[PDB]
Amino acid sequence: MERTFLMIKPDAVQRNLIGEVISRIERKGLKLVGGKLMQVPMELAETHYGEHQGKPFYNDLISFITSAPVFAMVVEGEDAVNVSRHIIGSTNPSEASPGSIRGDLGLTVGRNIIHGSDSLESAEREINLWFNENEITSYASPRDAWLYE
């Protein structure tokens, strides 16, 4: 089944929203398949946000993402990448739909609660970068028979 990478950012962790964010993912029907609270190594940060490398907000993205732990997640479900993006909401929390994570919980584009893989491509990249196969479980849930055909 389709999988994506999610990350609860240091802002959420420092605001004590880990529980709140996880509930919103769970209840949508996505399956938590890998997860770990971890401090982010300087190496890992740069390679993860490689694609932005030139920008006006890169220096401050590295310092931020490493300023406290994060909750790194691997979530599984049908259409996971775009479903996740849907409940996460637009980058700018001022434009993200009310009801979405960013919409309800975040204030500013730089401090916006949670990261989600933006494509099937970067999903597979990000999953392999943050997790090793043996950290990612794979299991059936009672509700699976009732989320899908």
83 in Cβ contact with 28 (< 8 Å): yes
Residue numbers in the known binding site for ATP are: 9, 57, 85, 91, 102, 112
CB 89 within 8 A of CB 97: yes
Q: Do residues 1 and 77 touch, judged by C-beta distance below 8 A?
A: yes
Q: What is the CATH number of domain 1-149?
A: 3.30.70.141
Q: What is the 3-state secondary structure (H, E, C) of 90-113?
A: CCCCCCCCECEHHHHHCCECCECC
Per the residue annotation, which of 48, 52, 86, 115 is the catalytic one? 115
Reported structure resolution in angstroms: 2.9
CA dist., res. 79 & res. 45, Å (int): 26
Q: CA-CA distance, 138 to 47, in Å (whole number)? A: 27
CA atoms 106, 112, 113, 117: torsion sign: positive
CA angle 80, 31, 45 (to 5 degrees): 65
Helices 80-88 and 120-130: crossing angle in degrees, nearest 10, is: 90
* Distance separating alpha carbons of residues 19 and 9, to the nearest angstrom: 13
Which residue is associated with the tokens 């979405």? 100
> What is the experimental method?
X-ray
Residue set of the binding site: 9, 57, 85, 91, 102, 112
For the chain, domain boundaries: 1-149
Q: Catalytic residue at 115?
A: yes
Measured from the Cβ of residue 23, the count of other Cβ atoms closer than 10 Å reads: 11
